[PDB]
Amino acid sequence: AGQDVGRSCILVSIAGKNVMLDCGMHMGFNDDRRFPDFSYITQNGRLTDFLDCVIISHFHLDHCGALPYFSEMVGYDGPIYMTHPTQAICPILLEDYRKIAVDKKGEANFFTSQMIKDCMKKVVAVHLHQTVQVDDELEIKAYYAGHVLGAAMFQIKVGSESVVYTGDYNMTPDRHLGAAWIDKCRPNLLITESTYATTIRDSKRCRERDFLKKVHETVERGGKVLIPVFALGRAQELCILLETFWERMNLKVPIYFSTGLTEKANHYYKLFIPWTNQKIRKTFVQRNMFEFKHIKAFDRAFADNPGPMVVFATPGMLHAGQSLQIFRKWAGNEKNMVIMPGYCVQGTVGHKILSGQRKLEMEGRQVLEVKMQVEYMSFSAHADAKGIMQLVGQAEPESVLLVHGEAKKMEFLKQKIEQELRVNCYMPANGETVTLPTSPSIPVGISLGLLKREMAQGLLPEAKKPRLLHGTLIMKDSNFRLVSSEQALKELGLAEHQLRFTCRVHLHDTRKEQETALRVYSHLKSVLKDHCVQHLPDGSVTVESVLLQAAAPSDPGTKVLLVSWTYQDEELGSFLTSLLKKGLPQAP
Amino acid sequence: KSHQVLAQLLDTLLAIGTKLPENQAIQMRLVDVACKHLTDTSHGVRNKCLQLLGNLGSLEKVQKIIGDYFSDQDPRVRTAAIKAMLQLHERGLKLHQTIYNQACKLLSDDYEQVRSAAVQLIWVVSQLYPESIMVSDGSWVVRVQAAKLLGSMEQVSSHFLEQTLDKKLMSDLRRKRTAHERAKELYSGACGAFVHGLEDEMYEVRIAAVEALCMLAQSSPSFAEKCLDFLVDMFNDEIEEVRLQSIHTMRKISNNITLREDQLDTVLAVLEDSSRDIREALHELLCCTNVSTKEGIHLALVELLKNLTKYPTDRDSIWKCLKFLGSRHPTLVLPLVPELLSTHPFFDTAEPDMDDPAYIAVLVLIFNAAKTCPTMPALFSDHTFRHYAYLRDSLSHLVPALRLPGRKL
Amino acid sequence: CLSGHPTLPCNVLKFKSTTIMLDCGLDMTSTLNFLPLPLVQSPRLSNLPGWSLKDGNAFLDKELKECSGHVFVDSVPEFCLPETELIDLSTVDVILISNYHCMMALPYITEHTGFTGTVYATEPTVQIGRLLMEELVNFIERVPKAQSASLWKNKDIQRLLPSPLKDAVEVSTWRRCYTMQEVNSALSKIQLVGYSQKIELFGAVQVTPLSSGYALGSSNWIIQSHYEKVSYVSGSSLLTTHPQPMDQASLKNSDVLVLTGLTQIPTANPDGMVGEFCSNLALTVRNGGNVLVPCYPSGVIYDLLECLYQYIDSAGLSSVPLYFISPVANSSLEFSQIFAEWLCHNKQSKVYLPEPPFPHAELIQTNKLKHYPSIHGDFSNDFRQPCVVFTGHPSLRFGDVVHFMELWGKSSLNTVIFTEPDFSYLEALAPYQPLAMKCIYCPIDTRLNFIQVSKLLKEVQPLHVVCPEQYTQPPPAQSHRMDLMIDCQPPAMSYRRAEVLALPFKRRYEKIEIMPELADSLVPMEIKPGISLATVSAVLHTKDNKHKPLLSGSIPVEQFVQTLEKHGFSDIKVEDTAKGHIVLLQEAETLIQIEEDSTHIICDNDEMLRVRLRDLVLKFLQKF
Ligand SMILES: [Zn+2]
Ligand SMILES: [Zn+2]
């Protein structure tokens, strides 16, 4: 029975699974919009350092934020291992997050760098589908899925109990994405991350179509198109598509982008280059991903509101200075485009200002007047409406847990579970933050069958009998696991107990022994025919398991018939023991 | 006695009875009964006697054995069963309609090398006859699309599904179950596999998908106006295979179609690379299609002139495609005659070069479009008449005959 | 009812084509043909000169078997293939793959006879094998001369007449070509398989890779049932440790330990051979002309590449560039660049531009490294040959090394140093023996040296280890043991010996799932009952508790009479015999005799007392 004690339902999902006396914290996350209240993870439910599996989901801090920062308090040298691609992107992302947020006199964050260095180089990498040797009776296998080019789900198998923790799985990939694989393992606990439940996902072609037409409309009015995104996230498809657009239209626009330590981004993207699709692998000789043109400018300080310019800010929702300080000039102009390639929670500043806050301050009583054409697309590449139902229909789950949803949209997410009630109706309980939801699991014990059980395969096939397949081979449980049919008598040191039930029936007849012998012989061929009985030369009969002889006669009017049957067919003899009791026939 | 000995004996019996005799009177029926009565206990001869009874056709009337064996133990015997039943199919044998119900238990098998044949089974049982049952009309297509939607889970079971749907589309093809398939959100059909089966995995399934698409567009005259967009926007695939296949599927559907703004996404396949063997196919495609307005005609003309001035080694294909374009729709170039050739209303100067491979193309295009035009020479220049007189008498396979007042006959 | 038996059709020691069968798995190991065999024919070259055309006439009016120093065939090299006849390919489900080497004969068994199943392997090995077959067919199809050697294959009564080294091998079925059809129509069947996966083929047997460290993807697949440890070994090395070195944390209680790859050269020293090769290349670049090193495509040559790169800090000055002639050279380079996860844990795979396997090849590419992955008009910029050229080739007859050897055939100016020891001395240089070159044969190969397999067998403590070939005898031209130590007995394999060394008697599967039943008490064997209706689904008879046991045990007469009295019976008279006991009950005149392992009851016509006595006597023993 697994516990699956969740820790969040809208953002910073840091749920943990407690099963088989093993507690595993998967993707320990932390909030990014707080002030000395939710900067780190909610570690108030545990005050120890006993974990079974510490696995993160993907690169950016929406699901893996505290596992790299709060490691100073709870430092473990065991299951803290992660996958392979999470070794070069994590250091640079935490570095830029520190120099962006922690460098502005934050409340509490990673001050020293030595602790970061050791908790990063202490991690052991995991290859593709590499089952890392856990402590005992546990295995962790990572499948493939294209979400951030390096994201993957992990399956923890602890004593016939497999739980799959998938981080933002999505379908319908593109050039900078891959296809999700499930391996068809048929698990029992499916903790999924549902973000777009009711909103149906449209095709990507019309998405790029509307993006290019709105970019053309913004460039026609000499508007500054400032697109905000993560440092190394879902912006690679954006820059590659705008590059293809620029080379197709042959324009001389600026098309600048933030540095964000670009001296190693292309190197890390082209070195491994394994967590991608085939469209880049077949043509690795043309440098389709890296080595691009018209996108080698830095929009950090050379971004002035003078003409039409395309800028790329390294911020999800204008965290500290990327899309807030360097993009504050192009916010009050009537001709200014601010494309958002992500959909965060309703707690940041830019997301709240775009949703319903047409006039709101930035930090403290700042300029609230902002009139533009800010419109966010669906380029977040998160769990779509079709992928979730395809997965729950192809996996056949027994319990669906919804994690990392929203505040109000989660109220509709459970409504989507109602649709599952028509296809995958099961114990689908959406646990809230810090609300554990246990589940009942089967036993799935372990036994050991000998070769005699193979004989049961002979009578099962090429036969019409039912309800009788393996009615033998009684259990022989001991310190070890072993069952047998006749070898139990050999291993316990004893022989077959000779049991022979014998009775002396009396018949009322004054005729000769041969006459009554032929009579009982002809009578045994009338009520039952599946039993074979032969006649002995002395004048007796014998069933294949029962023998009928004539004892010493006497009053000669009564004849004494000795019946004997072995215990193996004792009950059958009991049936025989019934027939002589329904009287003697009236035909002779 | 042994496991392989029985299989070898059965193979010898099949080679000695199903290769030479192939007749009745204890030549194909006795061996089948002997193989059926020679059952085993655990994967001994089942996979062998299945194809034994498969290659021995008793008579045109033996399906109960495979029907009850379809639920055997080893899933690798179901493959032998399905290949044997396909061998019985390709010889007729009056396949019943009940197998389709059993085929349902073949849709959810949780195994490989079975669903790739299960889609073929549902296709053949739907293509046999859509009677004796809604009524097998656009019903098995939904199951085929549902099985093909999981293309990322198997690279072999998705191409076979599309290849089977290519011929399954020859059914009644109800619009209620066909128009909703071309969209993500379904409007009984509750699946996709049309807009989600292209950009999912390697192109070996994309080829089968576009093959099924052109196969269903050739038979049904409809459905083309809503799939031409999808057939055009799949050109930026950076694969040398999908491009020529797109040219082929567009050439095979070049009828009752329009082209207003989707030309730029299908013509740019000649500038990205050389494509020596694809250029002739693209030129044959561009000439058999129809253009809505004159802007597309002008774009195609300037692009062909660019290809000529950049690659003058294939001028014959350019002249032939321009001839076909002028013979298809000559009216669409009528408002463009004084714009192609440099003419002045009161100067009549700037005579172009005679042997210029850039002006002869426009000349032959105008001459080919001058067939059914009411007043073509009303906008001609002075040297155009002598150019036509010289080109017509020199070659006749590209310049047709006209009724100019200056010429005779 | 069968057992596991390896049916090997080959007698090659480096490669292997074994097939370890099972009860229901029917698995097959890697299959490879004879790669070093097609060398006695004339080398495939373009622009045929006059020196390799006019030679000695044939023997006894053949006109198809020329002779110049030795015997040669002026026709297609006629690639070899194993027999593979006494096993039909219609009952095969999967074929195993080795470290980018065992697919030269793969397309010959996919779309020819059978093998309609699936196939499991990893990405780097299959990609390198694809590039190898591509360069092989590219070197074959250039100048595709017709086959003119279909006369000496038959009539073997006169095949023993010519000189030795030609009649030692027989001809059964040789294909000589690929037609560029099965090679690319058979590669679209491989599945994504990593390391230590849970594919669970056939629902009963499981395979687990090991990823030994020899090259890029030297995986040793371990096929194993519920209780079985069949271990197959393709290639391993314990000295390089760069490409994920081999680990012995899983193959402890192995069963057969099929060892295939060996070193075959125990006298040479890797460090010493690299040092002498460096000295030789230095002394031949100091004076003379160009340098030619005929090597294989991407793979083993990377250590030599790294050594020649690090040798730039020696007496050898600059202006000694490296040419690489191969049609798949750029593809191999980019594949080595992209493949970095299959390296060591932390020694090589550091990801900070310090892969130490392929990144060092591109780090020095900016100083002096011109690739030029072709020969068709690419050296027109500068032609002086103050360099060293490496040409990939399957053997010494297909690659472009023969054109370069015929180019500067003059001696005392070039080197013919090789890198692969899977050849010979008098036959490899048979058409080129009229020369005066040094003919150095530095054997770059590290495959499970005899000093390593010894300690491996010591730390494994194995049993019933099978020997691949008949090399249990001392090799010729050597004076040493060079054998393997076995405790039980040394086995033997040959061309057609299907020896049976296995006995899996369905050890323990039991398909245990939802088993709830009572448990009796005993000394050490708490026996219990069982349930029928197994209802097996897929290689598992999940006999769950849902909808006849025999008896055993002596019944004491003392406890019998005690329970008779305290249940309600009376007037019971018991007497003794020589060994047994006779008890009489006056009601219904019941006479019961109990002897050692014997009981017999006799009574009159009565049913209720009969069943009562039955249930009273049956609860005095344990049910089995
Ligand atoms: Zn997320
Ligand atoms: Zn994410």
Side-chain angles (χ1 to χ4, degrees), chain C residues 282-344:
Chain C
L283 71 87
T284 182
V285 295
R286 280 292 90 183
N287 49 15
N290 57 88
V291 176
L292 184 159
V293 193
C295 48
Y296 275 12
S298 197
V300 59
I301 59 184
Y302 277 160
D303 72 338
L304 204 168
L305 173 135
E306 294 291 333
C307 298
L308 65 94
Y309 280 169
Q310 69 97 9
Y311 197 66
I312 209 178
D313 312 327
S314 48
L317 319 181
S318 279
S319 48
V320 282
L322 173 143
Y323 284 75
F324 202 90
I325 297 314
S326 174
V328 304
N330 185 26
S331 46
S332 54
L333 284 194
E334 54 202 289
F335 281 163
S336 45
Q337 292 297 111
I338 190 157
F339 294 155
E341 292 86 4
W342 301 263
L343 268 300
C344 182

Side-chain angles (χ1 to χ4, degrees), chain C residues 132-174:
Chain C
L132 260 290
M133 307 174 268
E134 281 292 333
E135 62 93 17
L136 186 137
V137 61
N138 184 276
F139 287 155
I140 291 174
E141 308 290 30
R142 44 176 58 183
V143 182
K145 58 180 181 180
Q147 179 182 3
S148 81
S150 315
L151 174 148
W152 61 273
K153 294 180 174 60
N154 44 307
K155 54 177 178 300
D156 313 328
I157 48 154
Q158 53 90 24
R159 200 253 302 270
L160 279 294
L161 172 147
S163 87
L165 172 148
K166 186 65 176 302
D167 47 357
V169 56
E170 76 283 343
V171 172
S172 45
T173 293
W174 294 358

Side-chain angles (χ1 to χ4, degrees), chain A residues 58 60 62 147 168 382:
Chain A
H58 52 264
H60 47 288
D62 73 328
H147 172 48
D168 293 324
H382 274 263

Side-chain angles (χ1 to χ4, degrees), chain B residues 98-114:
Chain B
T98 174
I99 295 92
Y100 171 74
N101 310 267
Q102 269 70 25
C104 314
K105 93 182 174 300
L106 277 295
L107 317 181
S108 315
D109 63 312
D110 307 67
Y111 209 71
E112 187 41 36
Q113 287 95 25
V114 193

Side-chain angles (χ1 to χ4, degrees), chain C residues 454-482:
Chain C
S454 315
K455 63 89 181 173
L456 172 147
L457 294 185
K458 307 321 170 264
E459 62 92 17
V460 157
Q461 309 81 32
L463 82 171
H464 293 174
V465 305
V466 55
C467 170
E469 217 191 351
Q470 300 298 92
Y471 65 98
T472 43
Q473 48 96 40
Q478 294 290 149
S479 315
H480 205 69
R481 182 198 75 258
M482 279 299 109

Side-chain angles (χ1 to χ4, degrees), chain A residues 502 504, chain C residues 557-558 560-562 564-565 569-577 580-595 599-604 609 613:
Chain A
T502 303
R504 325 181 301 182
Chain C
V557 173
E558 286 49 50
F560 201 71
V561 290
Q562 296 140 21
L564 287 155
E565 316 311 335
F569 302 89
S570 315
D571 191 286
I572 300 192
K573 68 94 168 174
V574 185
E575 56 281 343
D576 267 0
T577 67
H581 323 117
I582 306 312
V583 51
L584 269 292
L585 309 92
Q586 98 288 358
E587 79 291 331
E589 199 280 300
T590 299
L591 69 90
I592 302 193
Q593 40 267 25
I594 315 301
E595 307 71 28
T599 173
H600 195 187
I601 308 105
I602 292 87
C603 46
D604 48 0
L609 178 150
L613 172 148

